[PDB]
Amino acid sequence: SSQIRQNYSTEVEAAVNRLVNLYLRASYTYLSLGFYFDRDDVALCGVCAFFHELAEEKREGAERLLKMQNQRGGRALFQDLQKPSQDEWGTTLDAMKAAIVLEKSLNQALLDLHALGSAQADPHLCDFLESHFLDEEVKLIKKMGDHLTNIQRLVGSQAGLGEYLFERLTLKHD
């Protein structure tokens, strides 16, 4: 039961639960991505750190959605979390490409939810999705696009060299 629910549709409640699953799935994918790059036969620690930071960010996003669900008087419903799409992630390039399509899928889900909020005349939802989701996604996707371009320019005739240099000179180890 709830004593607080107001202007919060069952459709939005369900969509928020689905978005939680998507964010948690993404976090799980990033956990796998990071550990792949820590394999002794891959050994690109800047890439491990990049994806593990994202694993944390996506988990935090899910947690924020869940906090909001409760703030509105909706009820969290958890579903199975499917395993990531790959067990091995190829090159840094392959991985960054997979990451961008993952992020575009999260972004599309955010846009779909915002559209639902608009259709349901739910401005609090609209306010909520603003900063900590929509702008963050745009910033992240831009960063990934920038990375992709730099990785691509580094392939040239010596892919191993370029992959090392990108991990050393772009990716942070702070």
Added chain:
Amino acid sequence: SSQIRQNYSTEVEAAVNRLVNLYLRASYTYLSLGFYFDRDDVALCGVCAFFHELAEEKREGAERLLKMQNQRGGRALFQDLQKPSQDEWGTTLDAMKAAIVLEKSLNQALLDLHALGSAQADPHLCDFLESHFLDEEVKLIKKMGDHLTNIQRLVGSQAGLGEYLFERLTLKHD
């Protein structure tokens, strides 16, 4: 007269003045609630503090609306402030129930105003109502719902004991 008014409908201007009255009425209700709990035959100081903090918050909300009214070139119009609905507020439970229906009424007025802003294509109004009103209301109503649940669980067979314990152990005296 105004030299600054732009995209600010008479409908929104009037609705903002009505919302100011609602916020000031709410502040007045909270002033009364707090003083009731400071009666020597009631004597629940944590409850006095809780409602008096809300009296301040609601006054500040009215003041923010009035500042915005002037920023947009609308004109503040004040009406009589009706006295609160009760002179005596019963138990902490009764009072928290009254507070939640008060807040739900303010929240509904905010939603109605946002809908009017949307109909009038007034995005500045929409931006304004966002943080310092819509999210604040959702957070407050959640807090009150939490309080209600705790008060309710404390009634049991010994209502006096539960009322004391809630005021001592949940409500802040900082």
Added chain:
Amino acid sequence: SSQIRQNYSTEVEAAVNRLVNLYLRASYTYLSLGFYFDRDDVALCGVCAFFHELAEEKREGAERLLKMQNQRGGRALFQDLQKPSQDEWGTTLDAMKAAIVLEKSLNQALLDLHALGSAQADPHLCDFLESHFLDEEVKLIKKMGDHLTNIQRLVGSQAGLGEYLFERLTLKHD
């Protein structure tokens, strides 16, 4: 491929991957437990904090296992994460009971893995499971047993009162 694997059986590698899944499942269960206690109709924040701390601890345990998997030259394999066993978790008592059987199941899995390590003459595994798993589990289960006893003694004739008092006076809000 690996250039580092030494004295690391396929059986242990597989068991470590299964243990990662168990820890991540446990983390997910604790995420759900915590959010249930943050429902406005439950509203026991000390209980939310207790279970969310455990969600973090279990995730960290999985991460440590995965780091070790790579240190030994084994390969992380992720499986679907099943949803928690319940959507609603009842009273704090019910929840603490569920938590203890969860922990006992993790502990048994640790013991089974240690036994496998012994059978495979793998002392590094045995060293690894020592502090950050075996002793931590024993300490945690003792804490949960202590909590259960205190919750049980607080039921008496007034369960609501006891549940409130335990959350206020035992569970930390730091």
Added chain:
Amino acid sequence: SSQIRQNYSTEVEAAVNRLVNLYLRASYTYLSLGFYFDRDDVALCGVCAFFHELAEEKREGAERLLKMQNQRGGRALFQDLQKPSQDEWGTTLDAMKAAIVLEKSLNQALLDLHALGSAQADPHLCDFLESHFLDEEVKLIKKMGDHLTNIQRLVGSQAGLGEYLFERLTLKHD
């Protein structure tokens, strides 16, 4: 003579003396490796530092074994220290390969000693080999595997360039 020896087999005592010789041999090999990379016609100072740090670590390991030998009432017996297997160590790649097989040999000797300790029911030996030997070896071998992978990816079509870059950008000069 000893007045303290308890549960300390002659077999373990002898094995500890042999392990001391192995650690000291390894230290000597690392001393040679480091100085080779400081030749004016090799001149890779990050590689000198890497191997000289290991020379110190291996000497310290021998010293710890010797301290333990005395703590248990065994008697240190020193043997000749054979010269390292090479006078010239080739490329950084060749050297890192030689280092990994050296470490794997030390690790195998540790495992053999732990197995002997188990057979002799000598848990203090087992406790001793744990942190400062077994876990350290696993961590070191993982680091060397990571290095090897990075060196290998840097060979490409320009081996000189890759060797320089690895020494500049991976190996520490702190």
